[PDB]
Design a protein around this nucleic acid. Structure first.
Ligand SMILES: [Zn+2]
Ligand SMILES: [Zn+2]
Ligand SMILES: [Zn+2]
Ligand SMILES: [Zn+2]
Ligand SMILES: [Zn+2]
Lengths: 258, 259, 266, 264, 48, 49
RNA sequence: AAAAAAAAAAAAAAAA
RNA sequence: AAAAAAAAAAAAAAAA
RNA sequence: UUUUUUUUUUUUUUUU
RNA sequence: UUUUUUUUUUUUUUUU
């Protein structure tokens, strides 16, 4: 793939592809594709993976707290013995310990603005905002209505309400598909989390070790060329960008790093 | 699928799946899935689902139709936001790819008589308002945002807006790869269409089973049992449903059909 | 099959199909299908590459109709050009290339097919624009037949449709989806989809191989509790996995003794 | 990295992090991170993990019930990665265990279980829940769940002073163990490891299902002692010592080179 | 002869007729007349 | 005829191997889709499959 | 000896 | 290259 | 006894 | 982890 790099660069300069297509059309590895993408002046946390909305509902005289991911359709439900701030804080702590979370959108209820919730948010380093935000609220209410309908559908076949709530949550999470790629809500969340983690790791790796200066020998030319910014340093080869924007790969034996 | 009919039914007893999910997982015909869901007292992403919406840019109206299950998009610059133009765009889209379901918001142009006439002519199940499917509620908005983002990268080296729109659509459809399979939208759409074509060719449809009565011999009981509705007539065996709500596949030698 | 006789007739009221399509859809015999076709007053009775397309222009009722025809299958696309100019033809070519893979365009030597706009558009998509008499007369004959059939269908449909564009779109829909073709008894759209899917088999295999070259697997061999690896993954099964170690050995490991990880690094 | 030392110290003082986590988070060298963790009254630098037991599957979980401060704590541990799910049961009864299993199975894919012969693990509620979720249940004769319980107890003791109630302490300990504690086999926390395993399983299944009816270089093979040739079958891998084949029926078979013929 | 199919069916359900007679009267082809007699619960295709 | 019958019986008995000694061992079985244990029922034949 | 096309014979499944 | 004998490795089923 | 789907055989013609 | 039945591989020896 040594000679494929100029072709990939010209292809991106023409069509503006993404790295997952460059790494599959020219068979070049992942980090080389990321470096090619990030060398483009136009292409170069999304705050959409860790946004959750919490609400409380009444059913049969009991209180059910539902936390819904804004993206996809993942939900988590718990029957609260008492509508108090301590139980809400405990449920938020459990949700945070189960899945990553960064933001939280709750209403102006007395329990959501209590001191315990603020203490939990401060301990967990969570930005919590209460009030009127957009159109995702409609989807949240739609999810709540769907949960209520599923609860009513199979209520008669069980004795306790907690078992019915758990069954409804399982049905809504793992047994209902639809959307892009035909993925249930329990797989879309995992897909977004994995893609975000991969992007963050690659960006950190590329942009951390970037202040180095590497002199390289290209081809049979014995003269030392450069200086060029170090992109990726490996066991056998290193990829770097020259001041002209060209990204190339040079073996360690032909590269000197300062 | 003799051994698949009972087990699939068991699924509907526990999680209460849908008939589409039954076809997707158990590769069963639509008629038997409909019989299964109908038999349950509680109960009373496809290859042909599209979502159409409009947007404004530089004083020009752009209409975008998006396939929810793959991400394929099609764009057209409408001279005016009228019912006739949108109906013509829908007719043009339906003449290239198979359309069996169209969903759109409650805008005035989507409610006009021209759209209804076109949908009736093309035999399309057109719905408006809140999407019945829980998911796919924001795919079109994300696609519109992506198109608006990519059009700016190309607008600089382009004279006319229509050329920029066409280039952006080409780039989005062919030059970008998705996740969980690593397929661009066009390849995924073509694969889904091919699979559906093979399945429908195998099915051959044309059932017209009506309300033919069936008498069946179950187990070792010699006496006739029933009468029961007819669900599927096959050369090797026949699938039937009883008035109680049980779906049973029996060999032809122990089935008598009365019209 | 008499019960299908009425309904099929109703279909011929809307879409003017041929006897082949009715026979293939409603399972009617050939003679009765031909009789149904004849009963309508307004009715009578190549091996190119996958990415081969042709373009043509026609004049009808003071309007310019641009037709792009697939050569191998017969799938067609039509547009109403406002004014016959190189810019409009280039825009139509760009629009067609944004839906289907185009690799070779055959046109005539007209004035609007040689303008700088057409050359720029063909260079942007990296396609070979050939102008002149086609090498195979069969392709030209098929294109002319497609144009004549489009004109006939437009004439048949125009009586029930007010505007010209709607009639052209309906004729295109009928030609692409309703009337069947020759070998295989498939519609032009179905044949095009099948050909494109068949052509796209090697690329998916190469992509799968390249992606599988990324996963790592840690395996346990024998009764030794210490884990081993990392090794390249060859195949993953429901019961056991097949791996290729760095030394070249091929090892089958039960599923309970194998753990597959795709690292975030590299 | 002089400016990162106070931030790392504050973060460790809030939740006690592993030395590997501090090394891989603030990019500090090993020596300074080890000095930071070592200079803590209730922290050690042991860093001696053990093997991943013997049954390591994606859909295999475990269960246990421990007693602490006169309360019953139910713990479920993912064997392959090390994920921990904890709950406080009002009573050590079968119904509570069934409810907890139903709650756990509603979040992550479960296809197996490994419990002991306790009275609550053989109740009719357990059988009904297992039948409803299509979960295979085994009982009888481990080390992983005991180690996780010991670590959870140690973390609870570490964080018990600050909090007032016990449920909050258990939740905080679970949060610390799941996320803010780096581990081996790729240097990732258990939650990230579990997500990675699930995603790679899904991707492998999808990619394998993408190609099922076409390949290159169909080959003929001889199976067992039967000298009759068989095939043709799709070629998956061609090697110097042996070849890996996939037949039309979906079976994968390894065949020595002397028993395979390649055609083009 | 498509318009004569309902009349032939009505005549057949009034009194049952042989397929040869139906073919001779309404000038239907053999296959369609055989189909008409075919769709009768109390008729056969012996023709002996 | 006697030799043929003896040979067939010898093959059948070699396949059987006898030596059952099943005694009154009790069995709990899961029949159909019912998850609850049913029985108890006497053991008749213990086979690998 | 292998491939393709046309005609003829028999058998199995299905409707009458 | 085929048959026979001895030793070694892995997997499936069964009892603990 | 008639008609559709599948399978197994015979004859003729065109190439290798 | 130990023991029986079956299957798949490696090494050595004796013949063809
Ligand atoms: Zn770019
Ligand atoms: Zn139901
Ligand atoms: Zn007609
Ligand atoms: Zn500490
Ligand atoms: Zn009659």
């Amino acid at each position: 793939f040594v000679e494929q790099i100029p072709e990939a660069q010209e292809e991106h300069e023409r069509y503006h592809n993404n790295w997952k297509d460059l790494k599959a059309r020219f068979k070049l590895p992942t980090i080389v594709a990321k470096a090619i993408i990030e060398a483009c002046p136009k292409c170069q946390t999304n705050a959409a993976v860790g946004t959750w909305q919490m609400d409380c509902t009444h059913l049969e005289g009991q209180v059910i707290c539902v936390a819904v991911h804004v993206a996809s359709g993942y939900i988590e439900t718990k029957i609260l013995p008492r509508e108090t701030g301590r139980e809400t804080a405990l449920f938020l702590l459990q949700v945070a310990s189960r899945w990553p979370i960064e933001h939280l959108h709750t209403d102006n209820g007395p329990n959501f603005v209590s001191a315990e919730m603020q203490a939990t948010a401060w301990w967990l380093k969570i930005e919590h905002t209460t009030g009127v935000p957009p159109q995702s609220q409609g989807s949240v209410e739609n999810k709540n209505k769907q949960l209520k309908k599923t609860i009513q559908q199979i209520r008669d076949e069980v004795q306790y309400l907690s078992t019915a709530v758990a069954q409804a949550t399982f049905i809504l999470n793992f047994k209902r598909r639809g959307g892009l790629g035909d993925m249930c809500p329990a797989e879309a969340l995992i897909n977004m989390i994995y893609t975000e983690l991969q992007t963050t790791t690659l960006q950190n790796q590329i942009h951390n070790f970037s202040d180095f200066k590497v002199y390289y020998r290209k081809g049979a030319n014995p003269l030392w060329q450069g200086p060029a910014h170090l992109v990726w340093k490996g066991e056998g080869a290193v990829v770097l960008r020259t001041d002209e924007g060209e990204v190339i790969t040079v073996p360690r034996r032909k590269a000197k790093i300062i």
